[PDB]
Design a protein around this nucleic acid. Structure first.
Ligand SMILES: [Mg+2]
Ligand SMILES: [Mg+2]
Ligand SMILES: [Mg+2]
Ligand SMILES: [Mg+2]
Lengths: 37, 261, 261, 242, 28, 45, 48, 45
DNA sequence: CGGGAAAATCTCTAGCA
DNA sequence: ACTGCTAGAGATTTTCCCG
DNA sequence: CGGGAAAATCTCTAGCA
DNA sequence: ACTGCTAGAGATTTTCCCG
């Protein structure tokens, strides 16, 4: 996640920046990978 | 081809031969035969081969009733997470539905509900409930259950789990609550190896936290990017790129031909 | 894991949690949790995700009745080509079916017929007809229409063409024959850009001609290949390879470690 | 990797918990948890209170999440162990309930409720509930006109309590507080899963004695030995399952 | 045709606005 | 407000929100928000 | 009904903080300020 | 564990061998056998 | 070797049961 | 011991034709 | 750098309407 | 102006662990 707007979210997927509509994106922290490192 | 065009049309009004048939028989470029088919109203019988995508915004729920052993089960699913709420209701009425939706909205953040066009969801009592709690209603296209694919898939999942635990409980309402529990907390998979309960908590907390983080970031950070143009507001920068909101349009520009003020 | 195995089983007899849920909760290697699920009889609820393939031998026909405007249409399809035969019959009886099948066998080479288990195809009169013409009958698995996917697909194609030409004819039987004509000769596509009539002619002629060619080839050519083994009969050789029939087993061997006698 | 000593000194000075030591010094949460779990001088998300109030000749069964003040409530037809066990099964299927406190009523002591708590893994136990009953009743009073029936008034009051009443230190509603608390608890449990997993190992760096395993990164293997945390390359150490 | 989204269209069929999934439509 | 009074009024009509909440939610000066509460028969400041 | 119980809760919080601070001080007059600085800045939480 | 695996564990307690029997004869996955020999104080490998 | 358009191949769906 | 398929609509890639 | 096994990712289906 | 999805079974590819 780079930027989160109202109707769009700006992401970077393997050195490739993309704009994704909000209704097409699920944003999580993911706590397992987090607690792991 | 002038000769063959007139003949292929006469044969098409009898046979409705597809374009390859006309192209092989009457020696036609594929584009001309295709034009003959295309302008036939009787030969337009197939949609395009694709599927849409449902809205998976963090605040959207999909609702639907499902029937089991003669009882009505009102099932809701939070689209982003797969979390579910379900109860046996006495009848598929607008009143039972208004009540269910009010309970759901008082327990979870519900911005929009998406249902089919059944009499209970279209009713004025459900409308009044949705107006009071601030819930937008999205009605699916009639006779299109794929519009509510998520809740239809979840009704299958819930029927399977109810079948698995049916003989652990006397009444159906209790099997429904046992299955709800099981699905929400005793089944892991999906995007983050989560159960659906864990996943909805993460989705909703992430929404809250990112909203706050980026609000503060935009409060403290203030710039103006000029690219190529007008005074575009800056969103992000890095790795030889900049993100801007120029007239409510987000575009990714390289660092070159872009100056920040 | 000895502690966690006993607990995950107790939780599984209540919840029937999938293997990821047990592995996350009770700290288990994925193989152990999978074994817990696997030995649960109540959790075996899904087949394997694949499709079979129907027999497309040059002599196999698939048969089925289809219903339209209250009349019964007996439809047959030659699997290899897509060619079709169809008539309106007065009733879905074994007698009408024996007659249809006898006509089909007297017009085209028919080695095997594949149908569902309806009363008309299973009848003793159809059996006697098939015994007289030398036709093997293959019965599909009950309640499995995908077993006759080709004729089910062709019944859709034929219903669509009948719909297209319905207002060119008074009675239904005539629309059925017009649609048969159209499909067989006025629609091109498939493997060789053919219409189905052209394609069945090519399939059947190719069968005849290749049979004759290779019979003569095996009559005149006579050798014995030894590879790796016994006296394998030679089938083909070229491009650094040999084809052999050793004890009714065809294997492709490289030219090395293979000597022809 | 080079903040382990910095984190150690920061904890010796300020006794800061592992969350700060990890968010600041960029260390895996397990290493920070060890730094905080190796000093003696430096030494609830699942608990619900259940009760049944009465309003206009009807039973309102109320469930408060103690840590957050989040409320679930419902007009139930009869103060009986049956409807109570049903309310509790519903609650436990919607939130991660581990413990409920009740006041030794009869609806709470029946065999049906104890069977439900047994099925769902809930432990039973026999002042905030009274205050929350008061607030719920007050919102019900404010919105009882806005509804014909009292069950609709109850659900509207619950909605207002959980999401429309911003309060506390940060100014959050009970909905946001219960979400934040449960997410922290998910972190607590996944961190415990990691630690529980890797505590069944023994390492051998440089060979030196058996040493507790703490991390196993892509370019290093963080360990512990003699209450001291050392970072050694993966090739130079040997990890065996014991 | 009046409006074309992803997955659905809106269509005017003799002053009768309909919404049709793109699977069930053909645009020439 | 930008007709915020109108919006705050209906929010209060349903949920009887406190003035701080309405002042903040609908960007209304405190005096305006406190008046919405004062006008309601079901509340007190 | 937020301050009413939180006041005692964060009194307990400060008692707990002193319970760890006291090992680095012989007199309360300094340990109290130590705990106060910890709870003012070195404990970050809440919303974000 | 399965009745076969429990029987294999009891046979280990009877015969002080873990991998040579259940991994081969009882078709136990190698991970479970490795975990058992790790827990087994009588199995120094 | 380069585009650009025309042709060929690929992806995917409904509808048949 | 038996088994999904077919035809069309649109997307993508390949090939051919003048340079 | 090499296998080999264990884990992660991919392909594909029924069943819900 | 709105829209198929989900979870499991088996196949395939990737990664990790001792060399
Ligand atoms: Mg429906
Ligand atoms: Mg339904
Ligand atoms: Mg049939
Ligand atoms: Mg049929």
């Amino acid at each position: 996640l780079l930027w989160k707007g109202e109707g769009a979210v700006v992401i970077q997927d393997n050195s490739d920046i993309k704009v994704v509509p909000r209704r097409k994106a699920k944003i999580i922290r993911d706590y397992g990978k987090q607690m792991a490192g | 081809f002038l000769d063959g065009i007139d003949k292929a049309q006469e044969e098409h009004e009898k046979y409705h031969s597809n374009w390859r048939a006309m192209a092989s028989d009457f020696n036609l470029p594929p584009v001309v035969a295709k034009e003959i088919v295309a302008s036939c109203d009787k030969c337009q019988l197939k949609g395009e081969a694709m599927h849409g995508q449902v809205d998976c915004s963090p605040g959207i729920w999909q609702l639907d009733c499902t029937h089991l052993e003669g009882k009505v089960i009102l099932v809701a699913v939070h689209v982003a997470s797969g979390y579910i709420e379900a109860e046996v209701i006495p009848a598929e009425t607008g009143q039972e539905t208004a009540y269910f939706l009010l309970k759901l909205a008082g327990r979870w953040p519900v911005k929009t509900v998406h249902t089919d066009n059944g009499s209970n969801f279209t009713s004025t009592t459900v409308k009044a409930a949705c107006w009071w709690a601030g819930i937008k209603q999205e009605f699916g296209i009639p006779y299109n259950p794929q519009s509510q694919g998520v809740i239809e898939s979840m009704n299958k999942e819930l029927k399977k789990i109810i079948g698995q635990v049916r003989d652990q409980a006397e009444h159906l309402k209790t099997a429904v609550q046992m299955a709800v529990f099981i699905h929400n907390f005793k089944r892991k998979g999906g995007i983050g190896g989560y159960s659906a309960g864990e996943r909805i908590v993460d989705i909703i907390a992430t929404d809250i936290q990112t909203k706050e983080l980026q609000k503060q970031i935009t409060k403290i950070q203030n710039f103006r990017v000029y690219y190529r143009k007008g005074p575009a507001k800056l969103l992000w920068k890095g790795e030889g790129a900049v993100v801007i909101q120029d007239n409510s349009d987000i575009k990714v520009v390289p660092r070159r031909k872009a100056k920040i003020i």
